[PDB]
Amino acid sequence: ASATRVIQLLRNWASGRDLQAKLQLRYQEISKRTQPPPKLPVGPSHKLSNNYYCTR
Amino acid sequence: NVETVAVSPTICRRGGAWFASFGRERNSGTKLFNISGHVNHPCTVEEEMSVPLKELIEKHAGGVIGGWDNLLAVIPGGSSTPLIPKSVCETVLMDFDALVQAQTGLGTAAVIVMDRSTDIVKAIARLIEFYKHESCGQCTPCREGVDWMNKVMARFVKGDARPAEIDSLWEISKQIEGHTICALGDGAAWPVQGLIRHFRPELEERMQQFALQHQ
Ligand SMILES: Cc1cc2nc3c(=O)[nH]c(=O)nc-3n(C[C@H](O)[C@H](O)[C@H](O)COP(=O)(O)O)c2cc1C
Ligand code: SF4
């Protein structure tokens, strides 16, 4: 946050906690909106043998 | 059969007990053996029923090419029957019951031998391709599954496949065998079963070499 030192000290005193530690507005700490592709593993029934549907 | 009909009159003229003397019990009589493949002297000869396979090849066929140590595999009863390795064909007789005990069956007693200087997977693939070319296509198991097996088999020679496929191929045969109209489905499933059961490590090795070469 672009809050001056005096305003920060005043707001932390009025509230009673350290506010800059836990801010309400989201900043660069969040993840990117463009991500690598996934691979998404397949389930247990994707076998080639010993996989008859009458057993599952 | 032609052989059965042709031998019936001699059985009548000489007696049934004389013909029953040869061979073991429930395996009586003489048999025509067509020994072909990697033998010095491929030949058709008549012999008593329960001859040891090695004795028959050593006497009548002139010995396997390259000596007995060169032997790799033998298909005793024609393309339909499963193949057997050198370990069990050392002391195996040639009749119905004993060959069934070898998981093969006597079949037509048409012996095809292959030494160790040949691609066994290629031979089994050719057999499967023949069976694909010879099925009438009436019922869906034989038709579709035998074509399907042939495609899988062709890749196996190349090794273009994976280790998981080998198990899958086995189940495919379980779906062909016993579910068709006639026994051509059984005769097409059994060679694959025998080749897998007795040379799975060879298929694994070929697959590994293909995976290494193609990265
Ligand atoms: C796909 C297939 C092909 C066959 N081809 C022949 C054949 O070419 N010649 C033959 O004698 N039997 C052949 N048979 C087996 C016949 O059923 C057999 O001739 C018939 O059952 C009578 O045999 P038998 O004289 O030994 O009792 C074939 C069987 C199958 C399933
Ligand atoms: S199993 Fe016999 S009847 Fe069925 S498609 Fe094959 S050859 Fe024809």
Automatic annotation (TrEMBL), chain A:
Residues 30-52 are annotated as: Disordered. The chain holds residues 2 to 57 of 113 of the full protein. It comes from the Eukaryota. Complex I is composed of 45 different subunits. Belongs to the complex I NDUFA7 subunit family. It is found in: Mitochondrion inner membrane. This is NADH dehydrogenase [ubiquinone] 1 alpha subcomplex subunit 7. Accessory subunit of the mitochondrial membrane respiratory chain NADH dehydrogenase (Complex I), that is believed not to be involved in catalysis. Complex I functions in the transfer of electrons from NADH to the respiratory chain. The immediate electron acceptor for the enzyme is believed to be ubiquinone.
Automatic annotation (TrEMBL), chain B:
[4Fe-4S] cluster 5 binds at C142, C182. [4Fe-4S] cluster 3 binds at C136, C139, C142, C182. FMN 2 binds at N1. NADH 1 binds at T108. FMN 8 binds at N1, T4. FMN 7 binds at N1. [4Fe-4S] cluster 1 binds at S135, T180. FMN 4 binds at N1, T4. Core subunit of the mitochondrial membrane respiratory chain NADH dehydrogenase (Complex I) which catalyzes electron transfer from NADH through the respiratory chain, using ubiquinone as an electron acceptor. Essential for the catalytic activity and assembly of complex I. Core subunit of respiratory chain NADH dehydrogenase (Complex I) which is composed of 45 different subunits. This is a component of the flavoprotein-sulfur (FP) fragment of the enzyme. Interacts with RAB5IF. This is NADH dehydrogenase [ubiquinone] flavoprotein 1, mitochondrial. It comes from Sus scrofa. The chain holds residues 244 to 458 of 464 of the full protein.
